[PDB]
C-alpha cells in the first residue's frame, strides 16, 4: 500500500510513503494543502464590492 507523491523541488522527482501503524495519529505530516480564501477575513461583506466601482454608491 505504497503512496508515490511529488517531492518539494530543490536546487536542481517522487518519494514513497508506507504507513506502518494502525492509527492515523501515527502518520507523518499532512500533504501540502494550498487551500485559501482570504475574502472570509479581508472582505466578509454581505453585498459584492466590485474594485473598479465606488465602495459606497
Amino acid at each position: 500500500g505504497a503512496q508515490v507523491s511529488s517531492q518539494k523541488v530543490g536546487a536542481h522527482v517522487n518519494y514513497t510513503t508506507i504507513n506502518y501503524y494502525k492509527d492515523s495519529a501515527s502518520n507523518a505530516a499532512s500533504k501540502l494543502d494550498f487551500s485559501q480564501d482570504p475574502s472570509k477575513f479581508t472582505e466578509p461583506v454581505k453585498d459584492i464590492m466590485i474594485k473598479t466601482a465606488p465602495a459606497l454608491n
Partner: protein, 281 residues
C-alpha cells in the same frame, strides 16, 4: 498552486477608480499594483508552501523541563525528589503557546518527544549504573503516585514509556483527544453557574480555560534503586502539532505572559519603542 503573477498593464484615464474604497465596510484594501501603476508581465513561480498551518506548526517545541533524582532518600522532601508529576499544558513556555494563540480553536494530533539528561551531584560517592526512566501518562481520574515505587507504576492501563539512558529520544503520537469538536485556546466563561443566595465561595473562584482544561498528568521516575552516587536528571518535553486545522484568527500576544491566562504585568505593557518623529526613515 503559486502566489499571484503580475499582468502587463499600461495607464488609464477612466471612471473606474480601483484606488479608492471605504474600509468602514469591514473590507480590507483590495487594490494591487496593476490597479495604480503601469506593470510588466511577471510570471510568479513562488508558492506559499512554508506558511500552510502544517508548515507553520511542523516543529517539535520544548513545552517544559521536569526534574527527577535517584538517591537514598531519608526525608519526605528527598522521597518526593525520586519522582515528579506534571499537569500537561503548553503554558510553561511561551514560543509554541504564542503560535497556537494566533487561533481561537484547533484540532491536531500530537507528536511528543523527550530529551533526558543526567549529571553526577558529587564526586567521591562512587558511580551509578545506567538508568531506566518510566514516563507514565495518567489520564484524569487515574491514581497519582505518592512514592517512586508505589503500585501506580505497574501501569496496567495508563500508557508508560520505559526509556534507557543514552538511547534515541523517546517519541509517541497522541490523537486529537478533545471532549469538544476542537481544542479551545480561549474560553470566555466559567466551569459552573453560581446561583442566587448559594453558600458556595465566589471570592476565590477563577475564570477562563484554567477552570475547564484537564489533559491529565505526566509522572516520571528513575526505575533503578539508588546508587551511592546521587544522579540528578532533566526531562525536556517536546510537542509538535500535526494533521492541523485552526479557526478564528487572533492578534498575536504583544506583551509578556504572567501565567496560564491572558493577564499582563504592569512593568511590561510598553512593547513599542517610541520613534524620534513621525518622519523617521
Amino acid at each position: 498552486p503559486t502566489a499571484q503573477s503580475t499582468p502587463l498593464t499600461s495607464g488609464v484615464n477612466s471612471q473606474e477608480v480601483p484606488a479608492l474604497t471605504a474600509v468602514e465596510t469591514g473590507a480590507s484594501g483590495q487594490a494591487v499594483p496593476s490597479d495604480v501603476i503601469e506593470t510588466r508581465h511577471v510570471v510568479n513561480y513562488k508558492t506559499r508552501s512554508e506558511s500552510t498551518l502544517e508548515s507553520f506548526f511542523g516543529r517539535s517545541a520544548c513545552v517544559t523541563i521536569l526534574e527527577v533524582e535517584n538517591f537514598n532518600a531519608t526525608t519526605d522532601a528527598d522521597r518526593k525528589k525520586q519522582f515528579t508529576t506534571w499537569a500537561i499544558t503548553y503554558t510553561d513556555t511561551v514560543q509554541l503557546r504564542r503560535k497556537l494563540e494566533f487561533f481561537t480553536y484547533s484540532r491536531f494530533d500530537l507528536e511528543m518527544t523527550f530529551v533526558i539528561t543526567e549529571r553526577y551531584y558529587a564526586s567521591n560517592t562512587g558511580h551509578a549504573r545506567n538508568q531506566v526512566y518510566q514516563l507514565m501518562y495518567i489520564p484524569p481520574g487515574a491514581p497519582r503516585p505518592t512514592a517512586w515505587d508505589d503500585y501506580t507504576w505497574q501501569s496496567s492501563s495508563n500508557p508508560s514509556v520505559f526509556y534507557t539512558y543514552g538511547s534515541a529520544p523517546p517519541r509517541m503520537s497522541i490523537p486529537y483527544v478533545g471532549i469538544a469538536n476542537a481544542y479551545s485556546h480561549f474560553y470566555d466563561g466559567f466551569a459552573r453557574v453560581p446561583l442566587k443566595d448559594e453558600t458556595v465561595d465566589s471570592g476565590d473562584t477563577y475564570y477562563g480555560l484554567v477552570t475547564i482544561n484537564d489533559f491529565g498528568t505526566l509522572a516520571v521516575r528513575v526505575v533503578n534503586e539508588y546508587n551511592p552516587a546521587r544522579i540528578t536528571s532533566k526531562i525536556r518535553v517536546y510537542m509538535k502539532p500535526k494533521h492541523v486545522r485552526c479557526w478564528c484568527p487572533r492578534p498575536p500576544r504583544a506583551v509578556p505572559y504572567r501565567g496560564e491566562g491572558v493577564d499582563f504585568k504592569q512593568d511590561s505593557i510598553t512593547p513599542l519603542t517610541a520613534v524620534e518623529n513621525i518622519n523617521t526613515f
